[PDB]
Design a protein around this ligand. Structure first.
Ligand SMILES: [Mg+2]
Ligand SMILES: [Mg+2]
Ligand SMILES: [Mg+2]
Ligand SMILES: [Mg+2]
Ligand SMILES: [Mg+2]
Ligand SMILES: [Mg+2]
Ligand SMILES: [Mg+2]
Ligand SMILES: [Mg+2]
Ligand SMILES: [Mg+2]
Ligand SMILES: [Mg+2]
Ligand SMILES: [Mg+2]
Ligand SMILES: [Mg+2]
Ligand SMILES: [Mg+2]
Ligand SMILES: [Mg+2]
Ligand SMILES: [Mg+2]
Ligand SMILES: [Mg+2]
Ligand SMILES: [Mg+2]
Ligand SMILES: [Mg+2]
Ligand SMILES: [Mg+2]
Ligand SMILES: [Mg+2]
Ligand SMILES: [Mg+2]
Ligand SMILES: [Mg+2]
Ligand SMILES: [Mg+2]
Ligand SMILES: [Mg+2]
Ligand SMILES: [Mg+2]
Ligand SMILES: [Mg+2]
Ligand SMILES: [Mg+2]
Ligand SMILES: [Mg+2]
Ligand SMILES: [Mg+2]
Ligand SMILES: [Mg+2]
Ligand SMILES: [Mg+2]
Ligand SMILES: [Mg+2]
Ligand SMILES: [Mg+2]
Ligand SMILES: [Mg+2]
Ligand SMILES: [Mg+2]
Ligand SMILES: [Mg+2]
Ligand SMILES: [Mg+2]
Ligand SMILES: [Mg+2]
Ligand SMILES: [Mg+2]
Ligand SMILES: [Mg+2]
Ligand SMILES: [Mg+2]
Ligand SMILES: [Mg+2]
Ligand SMILES: [Mg+2]
Ligand SMILES: [Mg+2]
Ligand SMILES: [Mg+2]
Ligand SMILES: [Mg+2]
Ligand SMILES: [Mg+2]
Ligand SMILES: [Mg+2]
Ligand SMILES: [Mg+2]
Ligand SMILES: [Mg+2]
Ligand SMILES: [Mg+2]
Ligand SMILES: [Mg+2]
Ligand SMILES: [Mg+2]
Lengths: 87, 129
RNA sequence: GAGGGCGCUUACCACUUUGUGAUUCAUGACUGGGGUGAAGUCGUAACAAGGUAACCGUAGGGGAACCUGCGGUUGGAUCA
RNA sequence: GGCGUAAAGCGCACGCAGGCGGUUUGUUAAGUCAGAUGUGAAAUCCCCGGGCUCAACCUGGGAACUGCAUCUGAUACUGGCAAGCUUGAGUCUCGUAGAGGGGGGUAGAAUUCCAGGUGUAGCGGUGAAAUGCGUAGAGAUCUGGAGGAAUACCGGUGGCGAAGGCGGCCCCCUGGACGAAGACUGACGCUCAGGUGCGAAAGCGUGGGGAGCAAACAGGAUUAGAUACCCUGGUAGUCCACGCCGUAAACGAUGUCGACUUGGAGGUUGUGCCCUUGAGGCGUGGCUUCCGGAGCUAACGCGUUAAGUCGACCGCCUGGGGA
RNA sequence: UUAGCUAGUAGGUGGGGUAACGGCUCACCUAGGCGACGAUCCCUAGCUGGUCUGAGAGGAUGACCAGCCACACUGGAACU
RNA sequence: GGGAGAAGGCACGCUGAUAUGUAGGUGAGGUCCCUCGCGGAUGGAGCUGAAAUCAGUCGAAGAUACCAGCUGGCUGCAACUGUUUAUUAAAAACACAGCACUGUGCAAACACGAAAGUGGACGUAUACGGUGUGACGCCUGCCCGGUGCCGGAAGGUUAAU
């Protein structure tokens, strides 16, 4: 992804606006790339070698978001509402 | 991954002895300090030494006699897949008295001979034969 | 007079009856294959480079071993 | 007990439940251990003993009755719970390498077909021939087309991908890996029954295309016969888009992850330093092929990418056929 | 090579009943409960202290003896 | 999707209670607003009104009359709904969606007409005519000697001129 977009992402979700490694930040970067890449997998439908990378991104987002749900329930609920994931 | 730090320690001792090392090294921990303390007490290593401020490296200096290794065999008993907790009459006696068996009892970690002389069982971590 | 008994009746329920499945055993002309048999008939596919290297999958064919197509494997032989 | 070759590692990955879980402190004390209490009917089994003259048998006392529950403790391990760490796992910054995937263009060589010119009697074929193509002028040959497919040399046990696989060049979209100094989150980890996704070729459906090649089929031979090899043709199919099938000697006949253990030879792709003092030299990573040590192994052989020493989780085998 | 099962079924409130709690039995309501830690279904079986074997962990089994359960020609029902 | 209304069985009248007519439907008043009228909210009188459960009772028989499936099993033929021999044949015949072959490049092929023209079509190869077959599943094997049809114009024979 582009450097201005990731700088936007860490500025809108960051702890100290430098850290780039927090769980909210990693889920925000993952969801930005997933909702950008759905447009690729709507026009190219036989693109399985990148569809696997999308499935990796999905599973990794789900692992981080489950760790957030175990860690802070209030932070997880406000984060899933701020992003716009369903569950 | 590192699903058994104690078997990492024991496998490092067995490998270093069977491959003729002198000073083997591993990352430290409290149970590793206790087991290496038992081994230095009974005489299966020369001396151990834990060096490092935040995360340390535990170093074991292996013994030898006429070139051959000192620990003949060493194995796990209570692996994490299947733990072995033993009462006091059902304690082992490895190598008919010669070898030692390390037991964690309520009074810290101690050789099974001391566990029999203190009258309580525990968990058998290893069979240093 | 109360109350009782018998009797009638309703409720429940067994034997019995019909209808229709499910499972299991027996049996059934004929048939798909399998196994064993006395010097039976037709071949000779495999083991050596087994005389077309075999084999795996799949499809077609053919008296039968099998043959050929497409892809794969070395568990294939010769290296002056 | 076992899984390279004897029967046995799912084709490969994702992943819910489940199983296991780095390290420091504090608490709890569930698992664990220890004492006591209740209890484990008696008979039997066992240890000492008594009797039937001996034994079998009868019988006294005892432990055992490997358990269950309750009370009381202990706190090393495991668990819960609460706070921390940073090595595990991951994110950012900047590049490098790549036939990784998907879509669209395009280039030349060659084969075939057509059209036209030359020019004449052979072409094609195998072991040797023939069917076939030829006096309607072929094969050879020069020009102009048209068409479809595959990409010579690079090209190398080279690279990339999880596996299948991927090979001219260009663009668009895109995944992954790896390296460097930093920074950051702070156990977020590993494996995974069922479940899902990808999965060569052949095959099927719908619709296109159709040059080569080519199962089926026809003809020619060889043959004892030859439903085969060999020859001349030749339709499916190969190809493009959508789907379906889910199989292979899907092979490294070696599940994944992680740790430790003598070396050498190369290749590949970074990167640090040193005077790159010329096409050097001193190290650290990742990936990869060959030889080989102890170890192991039934032997062959594998051998820091293990079939060595181990740990976690999963799959599978129990004589050959029948199958 | 049995993945769905269950309508008094899971629970509630009220009534009745029982030596006694309880859907034990009814009225009404809620729509539940059981299930891959194997429900439901099929086949076999009395269970246990023990006995035989085994070095032991186990495997097989339940004769006599002793405890418990069930049945008394088959299927029911109640009385004392 | 179907089979299927498979088969097979139970309840069915009147009266009383729940409820002196229930749930539901309709909404008069009345009250408040009211962008003021054929306006809108609680408001439910009156009117209508199933259907169910419990109890009673009658008859031999409660859908009591009229109207109102015979059901099941195996199989042939045809996929089906359709159409025909008006007036002895309604089918297993005809059609049919689908399949294939073939013709046709548009002033189409083809037909009706000496001809103009028109249908084809105010359509343009995913269209139209003709032919055979008759959904869907598995399939369609061998022969070009005969008769056709298509390609050849080198040669033999060949008309008017
Ligand atoms: Mg990532
Ligand atoms: Mg042979
Ligand atoms: Mg031969
Ligand atoms: Mg052969
Ligand atoms: Mg052969
Ligand atoms: Mg061979
Ligand atoms: Mg053939
Ligand atoms: Mg074995
Ligand atoms: Mg074999
Ligand atoms: Mg094998
Ligand atoms: Mg494998
Ligand atoms: Mg995995
Ligand atoms: Mg732990
Ligand atoms: Mg406790
Ligand atoms: Mg007893
Ligand atoms: Mg005696
Ligand atoms: Mg604890
Ligand atoms: Mg740091
Ligand atoms: Mg931190
Ligand atoms: Mg699975
Ligand atoms: Mg294919
Ligand atoms: Mg096809
Ligand atoms: Mg076919
Ligand atoms: Mg086709
Ligand atoms: Mg062709
Ligand atoms: Mg297989
Ligand atoms: Mg392969
Ligand atoms: Mg291979
Ligand atoms: Mg295999
Ligand atoms: Mg071994
Ligand atoms: Mg080697
Ligand atoms: Mg191993
Ligand atoms: Mg082996
Ligand atoms: Mg009650
Ligand atoms: Mg009561
Ligand atoms: Mg034994
Ligand atoms: Mg009785
Ligand atoms: Mg009786
Ligand atoms: Mg007949
Ligand atoms: Mg009909
Ligand atoms: Mg009809
Ligand atoms: Mg008509
Ligand atoms: Mg008629
Ligand atoms: Mg008519
Ligand atoms: Mg008629
Ligand atoms: Mg016209
Ligand atoms: Mg017909
Ligand atoms: Mg017909
Ligand atoms: Mg035919
Ligand atoms: Mg003909
Ligand atoms: Mg002819
Ligand atoms: Mg023909
Ligand atoms: Mg002609």
């Amino acid at each position: 992804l582009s450097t201005e977009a990731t700088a936007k992402i860490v500025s809108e979700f960051g702890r100290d606006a430098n850290d780039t490694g927090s769980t909210e930040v990693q889920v925000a970067l993952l969801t930005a790339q997933i909702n950008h890449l759905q447009g690729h997998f709507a026009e190219h439908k036989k693109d399985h070698h990148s569809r696997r990378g999308l499935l990796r991104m999905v599973s990794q987002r789900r692992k981080l978001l489950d760790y957030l749900k175990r860690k802070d329930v209030a932070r997880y609920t406000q984060l899933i509402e701020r992003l716009g994931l369903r569950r | 991954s590192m699903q058994d730090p104690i078997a990492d320690m024991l496998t490092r001792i067995r490998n270093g002895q069977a491959a003729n090392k002198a000073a083997v090294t591993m990352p430290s921990s409290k149970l590793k300090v206790a087991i290496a303390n038992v081994l230095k007490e009974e005489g299966f290593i020369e001396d151990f030494k834990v060096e490092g401020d935040t995360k340390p490296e535990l170093e074991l200096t292996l013994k030898y006699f006429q070139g051959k290794a000192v620990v003949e065999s060493i194995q796990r008993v209570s692996r994490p897949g299947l733990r072995i907790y033993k009462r006091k009459d059902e304690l082992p006696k490895v190598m008919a008295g010669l070898g030692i068996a390390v037991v964690s009892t309520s009074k810290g970690v101690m050789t099974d001979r001391a566990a029999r002389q203190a009258g309580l069982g525990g968990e058998i971590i290893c069979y240093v034969a």
